[PDB]
Design a binder for these strands. Structure first.
Ligand SMILES: Nc1ccn([C@H]2C[C@H](O)[C@@H](COP(=O)(O)OP(=O)(O)OP(=O)(O)O)O2)c(=O)n1
Ligand SMILES: Nc1ccn([C@H]2C[C@H](O)[C@@H](COP(=O)(O)OP(=O)(O)OP(=O)(O)O)O2)c(=O)n1
Ligand SMILES: [Ca+2]
Ligand SMILES: [Ca+2]
Ligand SMILES: [Cl-]
Ligand SMILES: [Cl-]
Ligand SMILES: [Cl-]
Ligand code: NA
Ligand code: NA
Ligand code: NA
Ligand code: NA
Ligand code: NA
Ligand code: NA
Ligand code: NA
Length: 326
DNA sequence: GTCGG
DNA sequence: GCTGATGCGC
DNA sequence: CCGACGGCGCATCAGC
């Protein structure tokens, strides 16, 4: 891609700051700069040119100049050659191991897949599952399989109650040729912002997907969010499909449009849209868009009956889901 | 790390 | 138990 | 030690 060298560098720095430095705002600064650079329609030829872009400052511009002159960044050379940093960064790739747990593990001499396997008594249930499917969760899901997964999920939900509507969101809804995992937005008319007229609405669906052996493991589960593992059925004599991560989110039916906007992403698109909302005097979450008062306190929810309405409130031109990718 | 009050 | 902070995650 | 930065679900832990 255009400016791929630079956006790769900034992404690597982003991940180091989050995972090793435990500096989430530096992580976000790097992600923002990488994002604005990725959409820039010219080849960047200096740090100064890049510095004109919002989110690129003095330090990123200096790194861009080094990268453009030399094809590398000395800072990143050093990080890659640091065994500890590399191990910490590696461990965070396991589902359930974050920057804090990774550092603790590495501090105790645990720094490889083999070490985790020999020390499973030190891992919680989530981490054990993350470890068990480590290779599988590293793989992406071809759209072809995402379609079969969709077919399975929508068929089973219908069986439970025809009044449920399930919508596959994330990268899939943005039209990606492959996805990292499956995200299902769920609504039912019994659950709205005014009342929860039936109990166990999410549970019912999870239970049915477990009954048909689609959902194979549970990482976390509450009244509105499920996080687990699933697998397509495979044929005789053939290699199994990898196990896949699945997220299911039950959203109030009357807040569908804020919900689907959130769950379609991308993550950086959402943060950027919410940032723009804030400078326009609104706050957006997965439920509502609200105006801000003088105290910074949000007011009552604004009327919404399309994704576009949310864009209209903040004076953004509508972006189709496919144009919300990085 | 960047931006803005 | 609670509230609030922290750590995991979307 | 200029301080915000997007916003929140679920799980766990500290200090009641
Ligand atoms: N920090 C984040 C992470 C995610 N999301 C939202 C937007 C994402 O699109 C959606 C699903 O999250 P995923 O991590 O599954 O991301 P994607 O589906 O976008 O990408 P992938 O193809 O890696 O699954 O949740 C968000 O608002 N903020
Ligand atoms: N854009 C900036 C830059 C710095 N600061 C912070 C950091 C400083 O410690 C503090 C006040 O610093 P000074 O008292 O030095 O500010 P002055 O305006 O007096 O600096 P100068 O003497 O250069 O005019 O404000 C800030 O809020 N916004
Ligand atoms: Ca996804
Ligand atoms: Ca997901
Ligand atoms: Cl930070
Ligand atoms: Cl767990
Ligand atoms: Cl709300
Ligand atoms: Na800039
Ligand atoms: Na992880
Ligand atoms: Na179908
Ligand atoms: Na199996
Ligand atoms: Na409208
Ligand atoms: Na409109
Ligand atoms: Na949190």
């Amino acid at each position: 891609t255009l400016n791929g060298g630079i956006t790769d560098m900034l992404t690597e720095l982003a991940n180091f700051e989050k995972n090793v430095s435990q500096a989430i705002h530096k992580y976000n600064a790097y992600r923002k700069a990488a994002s604005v650079i990725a959409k820039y329609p010219h080849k960047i030829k200096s740090g100064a040119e890049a510095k004109k872009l919002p989110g690129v400052g003095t330090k990123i511009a200096e790194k861009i100049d080094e990268f453009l002159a030399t094809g590398k960044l000395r800072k990143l050379e050093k990080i890659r050659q640091d065994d500890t940093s590399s191990s910490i960064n590696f461990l965070t790739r396991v589902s359930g191991i974050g920057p804090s747990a990774a550092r603790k593990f590495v501090d105790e001499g645990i720094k490889t897949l083999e070490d985790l396997r020999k020390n499973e008594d030190k891992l919680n249930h989530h981490q054990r599952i993350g470890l068990k499917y480590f290779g599988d969760f590293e793989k992406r899901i071809p759209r072809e399989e995402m379609l079969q997964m969709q077919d399975i999920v929508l068929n089973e939900v219908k069986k439970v109650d025809s009044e449920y509507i399930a919508t596959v969101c994330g990268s899939f809804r943005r039209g990606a040729e492959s996805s990292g995992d499956m995200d299902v937005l769920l609504t039912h008319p019994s659950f709205t912002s005014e009342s929860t007229k039936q109990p166990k609405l999410l549970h019912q669906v999870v239970e049915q997907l477990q009954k048909v052996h689609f959902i194979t493991d549970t990482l976390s589960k509450g009244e509105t969010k499920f996080m687990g593992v699933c697998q397509l059925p495979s044929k005789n004599d053939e290699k199994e499909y990898p196990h896949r991560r699945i997220d299911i989110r039950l959203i109030p039916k009357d807040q569908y449009y804020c919900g689907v906007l959130y769950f379609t992403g991308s993550d950086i698109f959402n943060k950027n849209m919410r940032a723009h909302a804030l400078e326009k005097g609104f706050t957006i979450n997965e439920y509502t868009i609200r105006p801000l008062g003088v105290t910074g306190v949000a007011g009552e929810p604004l009327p919404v009956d399309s994704e576009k309405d949310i864009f209209d409130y903040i004076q953004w031109k509508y972006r189709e889901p496919k144009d919300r990718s990085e």
